[PDB]
Write a protein that binds this ligand. Structure first.
Ligand SMILES: CCc1ccccc1-c1c(Cl)cc(CNCCc2nc3ccccc3[nH]2)cc1Cl
Ligand SMILES: Cc1ccc(O)c(C(=O)O)c1
Length: 327
């Protein structure tokens, strides 16, 4: 069957830490007072929660309230334990309180408020320097959570809040996050389609922190090439075909052969034979201001089929792409 895999970094973090650190099912939730929070407006509804702008009337400060839907309400201890474990970490959203919503009868997580800059303005106007700056801030959050034995598993632009006036970034929505335990087989039905790593698309369950690095590469490629999303699959199968049209089929077969993975036979009629493309094929006069040899080299080291061959977050921080960033 499949060849086992383990991360090349941070394998032992959940062994070295006490059981109370990762055994989220044993965690006893300390409930706060729902009456301290006044809901102001609904910001959005996803498939697992409804999010609101609210005011903490005990200190008059703005907060964000995430009310979990009953479907996500089962694995709430996992999200709470992860958020408490990571609290105070660089660029990690701060969990301020946990209350019982009187209407839904479900847990409601209260977060610090971020004065978000409009998402379309950021995509359309961040400069080459700003993209490097914010990519470095995301790496700080990813290396921190990985070093803490946690994989986010849903890295995408919707889950990164930026307050551009204060050069402030937060990695949010830890609802799909999981503790990394070497040898554990995880659910491949994680991350949004355009950010899913090849390991998820070929149904390889023994993945690790490196899944986050593929997702980060998809964000970078979209941003620098002005191509939203970069890998535009119609469904999860066409998603791998879109990746293979760029990275090539030969390296895909080398990857599946290394791990003794067998592709779903439905790929026989859709995958084809594709050469690896040079990253310069995606450069044009409308994105040249965002591209550099360093950007392409960095992207090349994230977007690799072999999850064990991608840059780790800490190695990525010393890449030449970030030399221009004020540290
Ligand atoms: C295209 C991804 C990207 C690549 C390189 C550098 C920066 C970005 C980026 C952009 Cl342009 C915009 C955002 C802004 N995303 C906002 C998401 C958001 N805003 C919310 C407001 C309320 C509730 C949830 C929310 N989620 C984040 C990033 Cl990482
Ligand atoms: C501050 C904030 C806003 C919206 C969200 O969905 C989250 C979260 O899920 O952690 C956090």
């Amino acid at each position: 069957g499949p060849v086992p895999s383990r991360a090349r970094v941070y394998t032992d973090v959940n062994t070295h830490r006490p059981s109370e650190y990762w055994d989220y099912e044993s965690h006893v939730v300390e409930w706060g007072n729902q009456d301290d929070y006044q809901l102001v407006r609904k910001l959005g509804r996803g498939k697992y929660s409804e999010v609101f702008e609210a005011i903490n009337i005990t200190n008059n400060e703005k907060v964000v309230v995430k009310i979990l839907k009953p479907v996500a309400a089962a694995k709430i201890k996992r999200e709470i334990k992860i958020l408490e474990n990571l609290r105070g970490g660089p660029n990690i959203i701060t969990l301020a309180d946990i209350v019982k919503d009187p209407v839904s009868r479900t847990p409601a997580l209260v977060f610090e408020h971020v004065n978000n800059t409009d998402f379309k303005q950021l995509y359309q106007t961040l400069t080459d320097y700003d993209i490097r700056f914010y990519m470095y801030e995301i790496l700080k959050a990813l290396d921190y959570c990985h070093s803490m034995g946690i994989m986010h598993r849903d890295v995408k632009p919707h889950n990164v809040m930026i307050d551009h006036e204060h050069r402030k970034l937060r990695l949010i929505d830890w609802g799909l996050a999981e503790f990394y335990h070497p040898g554990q087989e995880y659910n491949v039905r994680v991350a949004s389609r355009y950010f899913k790593g090849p390991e998820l698309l070929v149904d390889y369950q023994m993945y690790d922190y490196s899944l986050d690095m593929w997702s980060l590469g998809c964000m970078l490629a979209s941003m620098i090439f002005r191509k939203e999303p970069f890998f535009h699959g119609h469904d999860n199968y066409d998603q791998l075909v879109r990746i293979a049209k760029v990275l090539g089929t030969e390296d895909l077969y080398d990857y599946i052969d290394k791990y003794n993975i067998e592709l779903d036979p439905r790929f026989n009629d859709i995958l084809g034979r594709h050469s690896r493309k040079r990253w310069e094929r995606f450069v044009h006069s409308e994105n040249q201001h965002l591209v550099s040899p360093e950007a392409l080299d960095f992207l090349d080291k994230l977007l690799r089929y072999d999850h064990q061959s991608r840059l780790t977050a800490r190695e990525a921080m010393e890449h030449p792409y970030f030399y221009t960033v004020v540290k």
